[PDB]
Design a protein. Structure first.
Length: 223
């Protein structure tokens, strides 16, 4: 997260870290046994880490749970990042408490202008590299369709939305991929892609979660 703030310990209790020897992506806990992330974050041998603030220090509220299976959306296109969504099932159920909690799926898509909360452990610089140890947060609005499509001509599908600031300086970045975009207390987006980070006229592009609720509910009810 570029140009954001320190969230504060366990004030984002649905945020997970995906670890394969090292943190590589975020995710969102949607119930005791399931995590939503980005399909582009797929790899085998994922450990999910819940209740994290400093990802480099055990502070005592963490739960480290292996993934039993991963289900990439059947229409995910890694060239276009269309349908950049994946479900990860935990080998055992998380203990839900004040520091580890699930986020609701949306019943409705969110409106342009809505301020959303985006979080993660990704890069904090738009030029150069500096990764944080503690969870960073950003408030950003959902941009209109027309300004999204103008920023990324011929690249935005109906399964994508833009959020952030056209002036630049504030954005998600790599290492944030897979993490949550929460608007009015519902998971509305997944950190997916963008051209650089926090660049002028190049806002973040997010997977539009409200398009996938049936698929999520179907898949979880059968796996
Ligand atoms: Ca920790």
């Amino acid at each position: 997260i570029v140009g954001g703030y320190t969230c504060g310990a366990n004030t984002v209790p649905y945020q997970v870290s995906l670890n394969s020897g090292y943190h590589f992506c975020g995710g969102s806990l949607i119930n005791s046994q399931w995590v939503v992330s980005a399909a582009h974050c797929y790899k085998s041998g994922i450990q999910v880490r819940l209740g994290e603030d400093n990802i480099n220090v055990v502070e005592g509220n963490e739960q480290f749970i292996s993934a039993s299976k991963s289900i990439v959306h059947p229409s995910y296109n890694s060239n276009t990042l269309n349908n950049d969504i994946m479900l990860i099932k935990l080998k055992s159920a998380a203990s839900l408490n004040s520091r580890v909690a699930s986020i609701s799926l949306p019943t409705s898509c969110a409106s342009a202008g809505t301020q959303c909360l985006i979080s993660g452990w990704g890069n904090t610089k738009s030029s150069g590299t500096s990764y944080p140890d503690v969870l960073k947060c950003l408030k950003a609005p959902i941009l209109s369709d027309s300004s999204c499509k103008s920023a990324y001509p011929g690249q935005i599908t109906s399964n994508m939305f833009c959020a952030g600031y056209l002036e630049g300086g504030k954005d998600s970045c790599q290492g944030d991929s897979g993490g949550p975009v929460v608007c009015s207390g519902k998971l509305q987006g997944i950190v997916s892609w963008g051209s650089g980070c926090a660049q002028k006229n190049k806002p973040g592009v997010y997977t539009k979660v409200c398009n996938y609720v049936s698929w999520i509910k179907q898949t979880i009810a059968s796996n």
